[PDB]
Amino acid sequence: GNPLVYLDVDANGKPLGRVVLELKADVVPKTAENFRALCTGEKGFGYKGSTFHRVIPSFMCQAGDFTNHNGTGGKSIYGSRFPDENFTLKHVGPGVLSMANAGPNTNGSQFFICTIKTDWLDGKHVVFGHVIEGMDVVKKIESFGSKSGRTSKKIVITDCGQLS
């Protein structure tokens, strides 16, 4: 079936707990596979140790720049960037997992988890999964954001991997 992966997240060195994500490989296999492998780190790089760099309350929590650690970087398992696979899944509400980008066909490793329905991103960002468990952790992360996106705590993915 679809992969289940996890992110264990600290804020200021304090564990918040675990976010478990279903990756919709049935719908977006290439995008799911990228995220899965970045969680396990099996290609020699990935999300472990990277941060949530942009968090906007009543919007989303964005993470995944493990190359520049500032929101400008990241890379996929395929190369630096890869195409928008499809826009079949929509930004339907809180918990949606979707790819950050710098315009069409610029998926790398950066991703976001929605905290509301972000319908204006439909057809622009590739949705590829959702939160199975740990929305409480996502709400904590959200509470450490700000309007500008600047975080008020250092939010770090300390560990990550594949559950199934």
Ligand X SMILES: Nc1ccc(CNC(=O)NCC(=O)N2CCC[C@@H]2c2ccccc2Br)cc1
Is residue 112 part of the annotated active site? The answer reads yes
- Spatial separation of the C-alpha atoms in residues 152 and 155, rounded to whole Å: 9
Is residue 62 part of the annotated active site? The answer reads yes
Q: What is the largest CA-CA distance in the chain?
A: 38
User: Sign (positive/negative) of CA torsion 23, 50, 107, 45?
Assistant: negative
The count of residues interacting with ligand X (CB under 6 A) is: 13
Q: Does residue 101 bind ligand X (CB under 6 A)?
A: yes
CB nearer to ligand X: give 5 or 97.
97
* Set 62, 110, 130, 144: catalytic member: 62
CB nearer to ligand X: give 3 or 108.
108
Shortest reach from residue 62's CB to ligand X, in Å? 5
Record the tokens describing residue 41, joined without a space.
């780190």
Residues 6+ apart with CB under 8 A from 75: 45, 67, 81, 108, 109
Q: Does residue 115 bind ligand X (CB under 6 A)?
A: no
Shortest reach from residue 51's CB to ligand X, in Å? 13
Q: Does residue 74 bind ligand X (CB under 6 A)?
A: yes
| CB 14, CB 153: distance < 8 Å | no
Q: Does residue 112 bind ligand X (CB under 6 A)?
A: yes
| CB 127, CB 98: distance < 8 Å | yes
Among 11, 45, 53, which Cα is nearest to 158's?
A: 11
Nearest 5°: the CA angle 153, 108, 86 is: 115
Shortest reach from residue 120's CB to ligand X, in Å? 8
Q: Does residue 100 bind ligand X (CB under 6 A)?
A: yes
Q: Does residue 151 bind ligand X (CB under 6 A)?
A: no
CB nearer to ligand X: give 32 or 100.
100
Is residue 82 part of the annotated active site? The answer reads no
Contacts with ligand X, residue ranges (CB under 6 A)? 60, 62, 71-72, 74, 81, 100-102, 106, 108, 110, 112
